[PDB]
């Protein structure tokens, strides 16, 4: 599991469950190519998006579909999405945890990168 | 104005208005002595807490009364208050802005220290 | 000034100065069209990006060029940029402040929407 | 494990290791009584602070000794401590994860509360 996404709801103090996550990788033509996607579990985590073989060096974008999450809770939020754009594996393979803490008019994102 | 406090509401996307703020200074007996207090304005800011003369080097605590703010909005919060403890240090002229971004189960606090 | 961008540096406790900011508007072909851009001032703020006339309802993206900011300071960052995607909605008069608090491996973004 | 503390370093994108954590509980005389303490592990987590029997209803303060952590990394930070003050178990026993994301001039704290 070289890439994991974790999403927390800062209004309820709970994992954000069933949040759609789309990962893209920048292609040589500079466009965003679909790479992997999934939904967060009951723990607010999304495991198994990729493998060490497929997760090569590159620029990746993790799009967390926060607006659909808040709309299902009856909240009209500010953001469409939370986006996390980063270069991965440029100094060799690493394990990445991308976390997002959500509120209707704010989000925080952090990364924990381990070798 | 050497010390200003700013509070933002991440649920409503607005300044957090009428939030009580208490500032304390650590005494020689290691207890916290009341130093200044007020309520945030319509802009979520609290100005005029102290003066350059009174705001000497020392350890200060800013307590932002977040629970009463959320309860007034009908929202169940986690924290009793947001706390910011810091040492004021003279290293040329300084102005301190202590900011807090609030959500019911999370807060971020930052300081902007300028000359 | 219906749209303002503010950027803060959580490592130095200062406004993030000379940060490039690019604003885009979603077009009918679903691509992102350049809309406005600038660099943050000495106060970490970027004013005058647009006018009430031009800033119509639509989906906007604010890209804050955080990686170039950290690299100029000699700090190894995680993100390529901080991204803020939102819909501008007319529901009475509105002023949008898009803020970003930056650290090398994390950022918080919030919006203050006032009348 | 009804109470766990997790600390992350937002400058390095790593767990914050060997961070001292002190927990206090408000006594009937309104003073803060020592309750539990420990140091974060290699994963930035602190487990085993208390038991379901000992972690009764009350107001608790989690003091994370951030200044000593940054000073060991050669950084003179703004805050003395990160403090998290909350009422626990007032609607019956709950499991609490108290997380803190650290930077030299800012900290964010969130809680994940599960039944």
Author numbering:
A (entry chain B), B (entry chain A), C (entry chain A), D (entry chain B): 10 to 124
Could you pull the original sentences from the published paper?
Transthyretin (TTR)3 is a 55-kDa protein that aggregates into amyloid fibrils under pathological conditions. In its native tetrameric conformation, TTR transports retinol-binding protein and thyroxine (T4) in the blood and cerebrospinal fluid. Amyloid aggregation of TTR occurs by dissociation of tetrameric TTR into monomers; these partially unfold into amyloidogenic intermediates and self-associate into soluble oligomers and amyloid aggregates.
The size of these side chains is expected to prevent formation of tightly packed steric zippers formed from amino acids with short side chains such as Thr119 and Val121. The side chain organization in this peptide also explains why the residue replacements T119W, T119Y, V121W, and V121Y impede TTR aggregation. First, peptides with Tyr/Trp substitutions did not form fibrils in isolation. For additional evidence, we synthesized and analyzed 6-residue peptides containing the same substitutions, and they did not form aggregates or fibrils in isolation. These experiments suggest that strand H plays a role during TTR aggregation by acting as a fibril-forming segment.
